[PDB]
Amino acid sequence: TEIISPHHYVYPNTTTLKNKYGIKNLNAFLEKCSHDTAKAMINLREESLPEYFDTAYLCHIHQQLFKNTFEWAGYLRHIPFTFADGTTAAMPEMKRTGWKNAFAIGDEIQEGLQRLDQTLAEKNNLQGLTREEFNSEAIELFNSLNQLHPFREGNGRTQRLFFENLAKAAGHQLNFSLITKERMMVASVAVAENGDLEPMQHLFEDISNPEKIRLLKEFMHTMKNTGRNVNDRPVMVAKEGETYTGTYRGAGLEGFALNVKGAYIIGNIDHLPPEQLKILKPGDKITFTAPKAHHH
């Protein structure tokens, strides 16, 4: 023993992260872990928002969400951590294939977290800003905190609560729960692989704009009695300029859904002609252009 290694995060002869439950079975653990972190979220949302938004808080969120799951709850992945079993683990480098885009390695993690805290303190937690101004600044930090992959596990949950609170503090919304797993994967990869903010800006918009949030919430709530589920597919509210051709998938009170190349595009029921609403049966193949209004 006595050699720091990433392999010491997982039980020997497994790929299942060492946990407080003592559950070596991968699926058994994942179930237990999900249940507890679910409860932890409900409790965290109750607690006051902080004076400062910094890595101290990011770690607090992690510590609190995973106190019952991981021994290393509050700790970043570059800080070597000794388990009660005696072994010590650290993962300065996350690793991809050479042709893919890179996470921060070791010392880079802290240097980045410093800049994260730095720029936040300098901009008053992005407080006195408009949505467009805020989102623009918040996306930069979100992408930046994504490439640093601070924790060994649970980067997404704790990162998204962080920014959700950062927005509430700053007098805005970021309803991340509306975003499917698949959409986040796509928006993140876009930024990481291509350097493209198109989908991320789109993601933030739908999640921040009240009129669009109203639409997504409705779509997500109707995924209740069906015997189904939509994390595998990206769900989006049609961009103001863009035109979407796809099969019609019914309408609710405030919105309607299309199926464009697998993805679900949501439109405002008012942007359709009423004359058509009545006629449109499900699965009708419609080409819909959303309205746009530029200000100059």
Give me the half-sphere count of Cα atoms (radius 13 Å) on the Cβ side of residue 132. 0
Query: Has 180 been labeled as part of a binding site?
Result: no
Query: Phi/psi class of residue 126: alpha, beta or left (left: φ > 0; alpha: ψ in -120 to 50)?
Result: left
**85-88 long-range contacts, CB within 8 A, separation 24+:** 85/18, 86/1, 87/1, 87/5, 87/8, 88/4, 88/8
Query: Has 103 been labeled as part of a binding site?
Result: no
Query: Has 228 been labeled as part of a binding site?
Result: no
Q: Where are the domains of the chain?
A: 1-234, 235-296
Query: How far is Cα 87 from Cα 166, in angstroms, rounded to an integer?
Result: 36
Per-residue three-class SS string for 182-239: HHHHHHHHHHHHHCCCHHHHHHHHHHHCHHHHHHHHHHHHHCCCCCCCCCCCCEEECC
Domain boundaries 1-234, corresponding CATH code: 1.10.3290.10
Q: Which CATH number fits domain 235-296: 3.50.50.60, 2.40.50.180, 2.40.50.140, 3.40.50.1010?
A: 2.40.50.140
**CB-based contact 90:6 (threshold 8 Å):** yes
Given resolution (angstroms)? 3.0
Query: Has 83 been labeled as part of a binding site?
Result: yes
Exposed, middle or buried, 268 (CB in 10 Å: 0-12/13-18/19+)?
middle
Number of neighbouring beta carbons within 10 Å of residue 266: 23
Query: Has 130 been labeled as part of a binding site?
Result: no
For the chain, how big is the Rg over CA atoms in Å?
21
Cα 244 off chain centre by: 25
Query: Has 137 been labeled as part of a binding site?
Result: no
Query: Has 98 been labeled as part of a binding site?
Result: no
Q: Characterize the bridge pairing of strands 88-89 and 81-82.
A: antiparallel
